Symmetry: D2
Subunit: 242 residues, 4 copies
């Protein structure tokens, strides 16, 4: 029972596939209204919305390359134009964007990874704060941000992935800064931290997207996680037990 998610307007960056899409459908199951998003158009946008509505909810697609601040602005504007505000921001866009030994790491590499995993999440969240704040007065209860983190935030990632690791630790920490700045506004901030999606994983296998979605649902519903904020749930098969 996440019935308090019916009608909730939930914007998810980087959600035309993987964890993002699977989460979109699970939110849809409780009748949520979901902004899908990506930097390039999917092959079949209607089919994705079909899957949402099929599952019991609704939504629209919005294309934006959120490694640019302007685009994060434009994306929040559009979703808010279409529906009238945001009840939940899910920062899911992110990713490696390459591996490089430290000695071959030039400025471009740094900038690529940090725009994808750093600036994007900062700026998206910034532009959504206004609407999330207002969303929360209106409901009475709370708005939410959920950001996708990583096991790499904690243990430094694989070789090649130092910047990605660091960018994720950057996120885990900046959430703690936002719990300070915005709990008075009744906006909660939580992280799902995938791990990888064997045999340094106690369970002996990589996760499936269907195994990551429920946690997002959990942090999304105020009825289920209303007292929880500034926490990190690692969904990694025991791979790290912090």
């Amino acid at each position: 029972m996440f019935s308090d998610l019916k009608g909730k307007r939930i914007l998810i960056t980087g959600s035309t596939e993987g964890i993002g899409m699977a989460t979109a459908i699970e939110l849809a199951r409780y009748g949520a209204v979901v902004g899908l998003n990506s930097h390039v158009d999917p092959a079949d946008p209607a089919l994705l919305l079909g899957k949402l509505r099929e599952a019991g909810g609704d939504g629209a697609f919005f294309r934006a390359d959120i490694t640019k601040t302007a685009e994060c602005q434009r994306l929040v504007s559009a979703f808010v134009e279409r529906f009238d505000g945001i009840d939940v921001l899910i920062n899911n866009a992110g990713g490696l964007a390459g591996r490089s030994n430290l000695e071959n790491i030039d400025d471009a590499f740094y900038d690529r990874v940090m725009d994808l995993n750093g600036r994007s999440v900062l700026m998206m969240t910034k532009f959504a704060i206004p609407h999330l704040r207002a969303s929360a007065k209106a409901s009475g209860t709370t708005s939410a941000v959920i950001s996708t983190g990583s096991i790499a935030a904690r243990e430094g990632g694989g070789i090649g992935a130092g910047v990605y690791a660091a960018s994720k630790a950057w996120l885990h920490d900046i959430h703690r800064n936002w719990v300070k700045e915005f709990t008075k506004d009744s906006i909660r901030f939580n992280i799902v931290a995938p791990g990888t999606v064997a045999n340094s994983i106690p369970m002996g296998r990589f996760g499936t997207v269907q195994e990551l979605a429920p946690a997002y649902v959990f942090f999304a519903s105020h009825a289920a996680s209303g007292y929880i904020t500034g926490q990190i749930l690692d969904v990694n098969g025991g791979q790290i037990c912090p």
Copy 2:
């Protein structure tokens, strides 16, 4: 969608009131057969079965003092005699059991606190294992332990409660041990860590109602099937680890 909780046999310690009852109820909402528990008999046993049954499930009460190892064995054997198995165990029993500054701590105090928060958890978990082992063999999925931690494990607790604090740090960490030993038996282990009020960002205290959903989440293979060895801190941001 917690429908896989239908018929799940869920023994809960320290469950006649507080977080324990709340959690029993919420689980009972999904057709869980819950074992309620306390050292003392409660005033109205059948209300409590009522609440479970009202909510959508079933259960039974067992008196037992878990600060003792024979009692723990008994409780697990009683629960199994009644329901033929364990699918989820929830180590919720625990508490301060007094307050004392270091200079005033004797063996009796230390023994009281650690028997309540350490030995209990250890032994309950020890005796449940082969039952939980068998459940997951049968279901094809995973069985589950959940235990009630505390903010105090992370930041040391408050003056006079060092032993309780450390008992909780002890639990947090021994759960990491069990992940190593038992993940191959398809048994998951997770912890719900209640916080304790101008040091709590949400300006206020938790309520049992705000705690129980967490436990439901960790109890369900469909929800948290790939999650083990974690601690979900439910505390209005009191600490953000």
Copy 3:
């Protein structure tokens, strides 16, 4: 330069060998006065004191089985009788005291490990607090406790070692409780956390006692670590990077 350790009276439990003895000698190098200790008499007590004095300092041996509270009392009494107080308590006694799969863990096993790693450190520290407090008024500066922890406090130890792991996490946390109770008394509390003393260790080898001693020296000198309290230094070759 740890010249501020000359004459400092430093009681170290479980110090007739391993990390304990090596630490004793390194403190001795700066002219400290060191209580050695163990639950059984060494073969040659004079040779150990010889090594202390040889290195540039002094001390005495005190036998006590500190798994009993009475003995911790008796041990602190004796060291304080001999010298007139304690400037530094080093809780080094501890250890596995067996491995057991959880299903074979009876009460005795629990009790053995917890007395060795839990009650001992609690009670030793308790009985020393009085004297450490007074030591600190007299000096002006600070007293110190240093406790030997473990990598196992953080990641749950090896199979068989769950109670030992847990007992060490217990210690890491209870120190945080004592930073609260006793910083007003100018008593600092720090932990050295050995790890193991290969190839899940970046350095590819186990530590040597000579590689653990310096850290104890560091936390022992007020001139070097006077502003540091409630911290844990892991000395493990990168084995865990918290």
Copy 4:
């Protein structure tokens, strides 16, 4: 006994004042040849060499702006031209570079903060590596990086300083990455994490004098030769992780 610091070539960024100078001095006490550094020329360069020389060692000042990657390369090349190597690098440069609430953060702010605390560290470390690689090959022991972290990496920092906070969390964690890549080159990485006053158990602030010894400890193979990937928090108990 830090005698192995004799003749060690120790490039330090952000070292004309504060923790950086203090640390240079203390290292200079053991016969270290230190590289002082700032974006701006200081008033009296030779006093500073004086302090190093007085204390027991030697050194040289290099102007460079490390928020820029070409400048970082230059500094490492300059330092090597002068002293023929690097044995220790200390990434101490960094700071708030302004304060801003989230709703007022533009790209320029973010770029300013991360260039100062992220790019700098990364690039300094990148360019030093092969020098540090060569030192440890020659010594037979280990060479060393030390970097100045912050309490803020752990608890989020204060309102208006999110980016700085996260920049420090970023550093803490990338040091873990480097341990993996570079431990086999015998290069250690450790972090000294200054705290920032009724939330500090010692009722008071740190002083540069209370900070520098830590750095000395991490700088010496004899002292900290088996220590890598750690963060020593110097903060009067402000946080106890």
